[PDB]
UniProtKB/Swiss-Prot annotation, chains A, B, C, F, G, H, I, J, L:
Domain NTF2, chain residue ranges per copy: 7-129
Post-translational modification: Phosphorylation of the acidic disordered region regulates stress granule assembly. Dephosphorylation after HRAS activation is required for stress granule assembly.
Protein name (database record): Ras GTPase-activating protein-binding protein 1
Entry remark concerning the domains of this protein: Can mediate both protein-protein and protein-RNA interactions via the NTF2 domain and RNA-binding domain RRM; protein-protein and protein-RNA interactions are essential for undergoing liquid-liquid phase separation (LLPS). The acidic disordered region acts as a negative regulator of phase separation.
Function of the protein: Protein involved in various processes, such as stress granule formation and innate immunity. Plays an essential role in stress granule formation. Stress granules are membraneless compartments that store mRNAs and proteins, such as stalled translation pre-initiation complexes, in response to stress. Promotes formation of stress granules phase-separated membraneless compartment by undergoing liquid-liquid phase separation (LLPS) upon unfolded RNA-binding: functions as a molecular switch that triggers RNA-dependent LLPS in response to a rise in intracellular free RNA concentrations.
Effect seen on changing K72R: In 10KR; abolished ubiquitination in response to heat shock, leading to decreased stress granule disassembly. In 6KR; strongly decreased ubiquitination in response to heat shock, leading to decreased stress granule disassembly
Result when mutating K119R: In 10KR; abolished ubiquitination in response to heat shock, leading to decreased stress granule disassembly. In 6KR; strongly decreased ubiquitination in response to heat shock, leading to decreased stress granule disassembly
Assembly information from the UniProt record: Homodimer and oligomer. Component of a TAU mRNP complex, at least composed of IGF2BP1, ELAVL4 and G3BP1. Binds to the SH3 domain of Ras GTPase-activating protein (RASA1) in proliferating cells. No interaction in quiescent cells. Interacts (via NTF2 domain) with USP10; inhibiting stress granule formation by lowering G3BP1 valence. Interacts (via NTF2 domain) with CAPRIN1; promoting stress granule formation by lowering the saturation-concentration of G3BP1. Interacts (via NTF2 domain) with UBAP2L; promoting stress granule formation. Associates (via RG-rich region) with 40S ribosome subunits.
Site of covalent link Glycyl lysine isopeptide (Lys-Gly) (interchain with G-Cter in ubiquitin): K32, K46, K55, K60, K72, K119
Amino acid sequence: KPSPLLVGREFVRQYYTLLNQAPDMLHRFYGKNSSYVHGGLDSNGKPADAVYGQKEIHRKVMSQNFTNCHTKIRHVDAHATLNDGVVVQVMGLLSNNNQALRRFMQTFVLAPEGSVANKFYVHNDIFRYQDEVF
Amino acid sequence: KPSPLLVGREFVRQYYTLLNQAPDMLHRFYGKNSSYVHGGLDSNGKPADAVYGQKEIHRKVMSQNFTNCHTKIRHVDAHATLNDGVVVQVMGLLSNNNQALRRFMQTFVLAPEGSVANKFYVHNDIFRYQDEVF
Amino acid sequence: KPSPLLVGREFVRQYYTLLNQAPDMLHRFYGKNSSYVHGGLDSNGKPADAVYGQKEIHRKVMSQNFTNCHTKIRHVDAHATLNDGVVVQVMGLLSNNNQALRRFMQTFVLAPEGSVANKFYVHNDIFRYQDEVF
Amino acid sequence: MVMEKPSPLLVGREFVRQYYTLLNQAPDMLHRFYGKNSSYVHGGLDSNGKPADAVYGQKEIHRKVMSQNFTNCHTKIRHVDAHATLNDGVVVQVMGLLSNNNQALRRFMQTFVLAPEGSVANKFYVHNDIFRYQDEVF
Amino acid sequence: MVMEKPSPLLVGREFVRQYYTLLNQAPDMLHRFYGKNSSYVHGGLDSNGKPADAVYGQKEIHRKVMSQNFTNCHTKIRHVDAHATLNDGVVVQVMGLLSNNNQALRRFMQTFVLAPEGSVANKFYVHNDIFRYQDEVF
Amino acid sequence: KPSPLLVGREFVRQYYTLLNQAPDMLHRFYGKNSSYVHGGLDSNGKPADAVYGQKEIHRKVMSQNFTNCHTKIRHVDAHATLNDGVVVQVMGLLSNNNQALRRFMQTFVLAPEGSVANKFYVHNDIFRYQDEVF
Amino acid sequence: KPSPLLVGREFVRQYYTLLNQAPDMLHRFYGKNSSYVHGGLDSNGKPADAVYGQKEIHRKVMSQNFTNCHTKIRHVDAHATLNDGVVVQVMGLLSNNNQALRRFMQTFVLAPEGSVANKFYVHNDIFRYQDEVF
Amino acid sequence: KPSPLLVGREFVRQYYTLLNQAPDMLHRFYGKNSSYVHGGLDSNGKPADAVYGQKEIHRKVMSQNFTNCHTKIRHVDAHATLNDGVVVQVMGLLSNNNQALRRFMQTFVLAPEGSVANKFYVHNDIFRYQDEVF
Amino acid sequence: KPSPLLVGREFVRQYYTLLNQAPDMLHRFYGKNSSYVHGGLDSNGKPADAVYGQKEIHRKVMSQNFTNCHTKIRHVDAHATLNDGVVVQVMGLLSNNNQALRRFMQTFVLAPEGSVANKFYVHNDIFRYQDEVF
Amino acid sequence: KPSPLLVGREFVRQYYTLLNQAPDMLHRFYGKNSSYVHGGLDSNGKPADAVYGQKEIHRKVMSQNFTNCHTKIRHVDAHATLNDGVVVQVMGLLSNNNQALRRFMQTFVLAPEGSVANKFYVHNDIFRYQDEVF
Amino acid sequence: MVMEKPSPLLVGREFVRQYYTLLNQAPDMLHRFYGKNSSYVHGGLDSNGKPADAVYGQKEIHRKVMSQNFTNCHTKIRHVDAHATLNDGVVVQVMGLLSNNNQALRRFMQTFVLAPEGSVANKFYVHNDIFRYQDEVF
Amino acid sequence: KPSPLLVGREFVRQYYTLLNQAPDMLHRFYGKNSSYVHGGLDSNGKPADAVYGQKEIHRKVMSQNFTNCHTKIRHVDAHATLNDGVVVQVMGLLSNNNQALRRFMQTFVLAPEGSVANKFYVHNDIFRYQDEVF
Amino acid sequence: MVMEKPSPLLVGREFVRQYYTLLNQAPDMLHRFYGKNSSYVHGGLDSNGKPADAVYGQKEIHRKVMSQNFTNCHTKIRHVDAHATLNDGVVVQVMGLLSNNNQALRRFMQTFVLAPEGSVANKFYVHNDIFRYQDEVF
Amino acid sequence: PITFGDFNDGEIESLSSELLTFGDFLPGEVDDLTDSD
Amino acid sequence: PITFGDFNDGEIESLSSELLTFGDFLPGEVDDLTDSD
Amino acid sequence: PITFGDFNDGEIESLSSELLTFGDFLPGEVDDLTDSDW
Amino acid sequence: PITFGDFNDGEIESLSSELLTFGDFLPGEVDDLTDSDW
Amino acid sequence: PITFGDFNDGEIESLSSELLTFGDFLPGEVDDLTDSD
Amino acid sequence: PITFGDFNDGEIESLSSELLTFGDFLPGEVDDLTDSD
């Protein structure tokens, strides 16, 4: 029974290490009923919708083609949630392809597997850049 | 059963209208053992801690001293999470006492009542500004 | 061939219902080469420039930024115009962002799309307050 | 010296000016502004408490304008907004003050829908006229 | 970690919150906010149609607040603006809605002038309190 | 020693008379270190920082550019404050640029100049409108 | 005799108030054989010719179609001239029918009435915009 | 002996607490040969020079008008120097008269008195606002 | 004996020219137990550990790797301090490897050799950027 | 009266010496109504805007912002103009911000101030890098 | 139709054009550009490794300009900058390329100081002319 | 299978030929993962921002204003690199807009498309003027 | 403590530092920077006047670096620009001054292409090295 | 079946959820507090 | 004698010219037309 | 005992150690009275 | 034993534990060689 | 005494202060390093 | 057959017209005038 705050901090550390160390390895963090948004746009101008399923999450990650992503974490706030879950709020700056950093907004929902102790998986993940909304 | 997007949009509308009109009546949105971290600054300058319980949530809401809270909702995302709950990410502007609008997010986690069907209560509430982190 | 008065009441009810609930979908009422003119957004707020097209109408609606806009319709007049069109002159009280009830008048000109019977789209939409003119 | 067709805003404002000046001076000639299929309300209030219905015709429009028999009425237009609409016509939204037979200043709401005459270019007639006072509605 | 002292806006808002919460809870204890030379008027109306006058001393404010029932009143503050003024004090201007004994909410106009006590740092008392509902005025 | 009520009425009359006739000489009422806040002047119109000093007060007054701003005073309360000062609360109707009558609060705090008896200057000048709040 | 500057200030205020309120009553300010060149570009783009006499001035003012003429007066200069007249140069912003404010000058020459002392009539009026020239 | 970083942090805390709470007590920090600059502009816009001596330092502090100064400290870096003195580098934001916060750059030099243990006095003090230089 | 301002100006010119030309050769500006601080981020991110001793400053400068380090001095202040030393506050812009100019300050404390007159060695050197603390 | 060649040599030596040491005091060479053009950078580097007066010359010099600008004068010609003035044409190599040698020409027109004999001020100062043209 | 006596930049450019066109076409006529107290240097190089000195006077200006033979010379002016100066004069700074008798494009470096004649308005003569090639200096 | 040296010379010739004739087609040489840096102009020419993609590369070329850019290539070195690619490093004299011969380095990294044999595209394109650095 | 892998610019600059410090300290160890398929040319001139060719292997790398036998050479790097390229490698473009065996500094012009080793993460070797002086080219 | 634009029959009717309530608020209670009060 | 700021006794009383009329408007007729009505 | 200037031990903290209060209410009574409500 | 996303304990630390090196130099070898110079 | 502007004879010559050195640098050797190359 | 990008066999070689002249200039006179002269 670890502290949600430390659980969220360690999860964000691992997630943003794996984002650039191995972007194609990111799908292992999610599960069956898992959502995913990473701040996309289209012709209509509306932000991109979510995708569900591990395969769809992996395909979306490869489409977004994260290369050498650099992340500065300005804030992490983790709290307890149903089924001993953890809700994580992430405030930071993200830069893709070594380009200009953009302020980014992130909400993780991590749920226990229920089979292994302290085993968490990313049930939900929402991401959005500041410039694309404000 | 309604869509998570519908639930999130309706809850965002009701919550951010009640915040402007009757901030003292905002404590009825939460239930027992519910998180509320609508802060950001404390004596040491670090992000504020959490208050749990309806009494503590009401006390902290009164402490915030909401006066004609004008909200400006730039974006709302709603997804279905574990235990039939709904996770909402809200981005926008907030102005308290008719001051300058400050950019913010708010993460809601809404849990479903076991007894009453189609009933939700705010299990988790997280609020953050830009100027307190960036 | 429905009664123009009945079409006017139906349109006013649906239009303000969707306006109160989900502002992002207001452009769904409008089609192509349709005119939308409102109170006006500028550094001074004086010059109100109309916009045309679904994309520009949606952009303008998002920029002018409806949120929990309560409308009390004092009066609606519906009449028959050219090409079997409808003209709706509406007087009411509008409160956007939970401001006070402000007197407003709004004129719709609706034309049938032709493909589907009993189907109308906003060809002209002129909105105006009383505080900024009178 | 390019001979440009008038902008819809110009047509709307010019129509408002002529309409209200002629209404102030010679209401008897006002009926000629409307065509055969002309719908019209002007601050109506029947003996029930509800706003009066619309009327639908030139000769009847003449009967109406003699019914309210404006004399030396004063009009002060505060806003005019004209836009293009179907069949080349212009939709005009008008707001201001009107006092008939030297009563107090009353706010009013007016919407105009004009249609081309078809035979002569740049010729319009009042297809739709909606006018209601603010006190009779609010 | 710098202790600092509260900004005048912070003092004004904090005072407004305490004053109105104590008014809603224990109106009898409202008199402790004032001093020996405190002027106070709370939405009065004499038997002439003109607004009533003000009291000028702790005992008179206590008498007045006992005069009006002031019980279980609900207040919703829409605007608070506080500025520094003479002798380190804070002038506070308040706008909102008040409803005493569960009547309809009526808009009110309020101005607060606070004064440091001097004996104790960061301690203030209500030197001037002007309050009138904008229904007996407009 | 003039009555606080008497000086309040004298000042309210003289100040609004000069404000109606020649706005450029409004700053003559104020001295040094005096605070002046009036309405809201910004891109959104909500925030308006108070200005201090005769130069800044005159600049703000010119920026606002009062022109035939007619005032109908409905109520004036004058009371005695510290340093033999005067506090003047004014309720009235203001119409700038020949617009409609708008309800307004004004709050003057006047301090004696000391050099001349029965001499006062506007130490504090708070202005608020009706439409801005509620 | 009142100072030329005060006469100019008062006349500017009265004229630009009557222009907004009662444009049809503006013809009373002028007298017999008085110039009035307020207007835009002609068919060939040349400046409009003058109109002389009360009837012609009224006809030109009515044709100008001054509806809700909002003025924003930046500068007024008034100087004494020949025959005890006053020449006023006015610069400001004008907006007819709530459109965008346009920069303008307007030169008045006010001649004293021979019969009634302390009374002036507008012998000359020369109005022009900026975009029509620059 | 205590750590130079610790004594520098303590001095910064005390100095700014005094600078807000009791500005007229600030001269007691400085000594006979102390210098003082606080970012003044005069003549050709060149920054203001320094003043020396306790009396001149007090006069400059009084003339600079410090009222309810709010200071946010973003960086403090203290190091050992000659005669066990401490050099302090301060980065932050300062707001005077509750106005807009301005970025500020500061350098303190603190020297031991000589006889009283752990007793330091401000030998040198340099202050500069960012907008006045950059 | 030269003026402290002259000493500061000359040292700033020499040091910031040698930084561009021969960064590896900078180690002879310091001496025994001299504090060098110039650095960026660490595990904590805010502070940078100081390096003492000629070998340590040389190692730290080599780690810094200045390549065509273009400086841009906006302001220099120089004041006398204890034991004839000079404290210099430098504000300006820095650009390493022809990148974007970044705002910075640098505090120097120069102490005199007793052996040679007009012989100053950098006892203290502190460097900081605006973007790294703001 | 001294030889114009001697005046030219003295002025070129002294002017470039002060340029190398303290750029801020360059304006001291110039007086009133004196013209100064140097290179040029407004939006693209082509527009060379002349500046006049000591204040504007000092502002331009501070914007051009030399830092250890080095100069190697290859040739100087001095001749006698009207009003006993001197014309000095200088060709040389300039290196600003420790950059590479760049060919340049600088033309001075120096006038005697009359009050003091053998006293001259830079009436005209035209600088131009050879590389910008050709 | 404001006369608007020419700006110093215009005078400088016009003078440069005329001077160099006349030099290219009829260089024997170049001496009339200079007055009695005119200083002249044109790419001098004495037999010592140092640039040659100046010539002060119109007659010897003509002598030296004939001394340097000028046949079908080609000039391409790449910069002219003229500014007003004392005694209503104009100071002109000029750069370009000059080739005499068809040699290579030599990069030259020139400064002009003009003086009003005084007898007739808008009349100027070359008071000072400094001209050196880049090769002979760098 | 061609020689790396041979393809290097062929590509350098063709690339500068197209650059001289029709710069607007330069983007046809690049793909979607291509990186392009060339000179730089953000504030004073120092910040060079990389661009990626054909659209961004074309926009950058149009902003970089190639018109009649004459290139005298002094040296070309072509070598074999990863994925059977080539690396070209060329030194030359470039004159854009008919300026003077300026020394420059240009480094291409060319990758085979794979679809067609003996086909290459500019994967990396680094341009740098020698004068702006040295 | 997010463990981000080094950016291409960071790894390029770090490699440049290490390369030009080890070149000054121990040139004999310079060959260990290259691999089996490493192509390297370092500002050579053959006995013809044309720039020398490049060697294509670690052993010939060692033989070449012993051939120009750098001793206490001074290097001053003025520009380094590194970009990520194909196969995760980094292409580096470097310009500065180099003086070998204590002669005057010579302007040089260099291009680096590095490749991952494959076995150990974040390990690179100099696949391609092109170096020429501006004296031998211009 | 009167619809406007490309709106299906009852699309915004389904978009409007009258029985969706949060906390212990009764249906329409929030509107009641924030309407004419 | 009570004045505010730096105004003298009756400064803006002298500034206010009630008998200043323009055109054929009677004294104060323009104001009476403007206010109320 | 680190002190600066000529101030005594903790003079600055003593001077600045005072919470914001109104009237006769020592800091806390108002919160006590509002604690009665839910 | 705190692990996430079906990753073995310390799978990420082990993966990212490597340092930036060039050639066959051990981490710090170049620094050791240049340490000889003063 | 040829001087320019408001400079006195020797003002900026004294401002030069060639004798000032820092660290263990010999007088002028820093200039020697930077100016040569 | 060696091409780059998306160019065909001598696409820009055929695009580059060497015999296109304007005015009295010979086919290359402008190039020769600009180059080295």
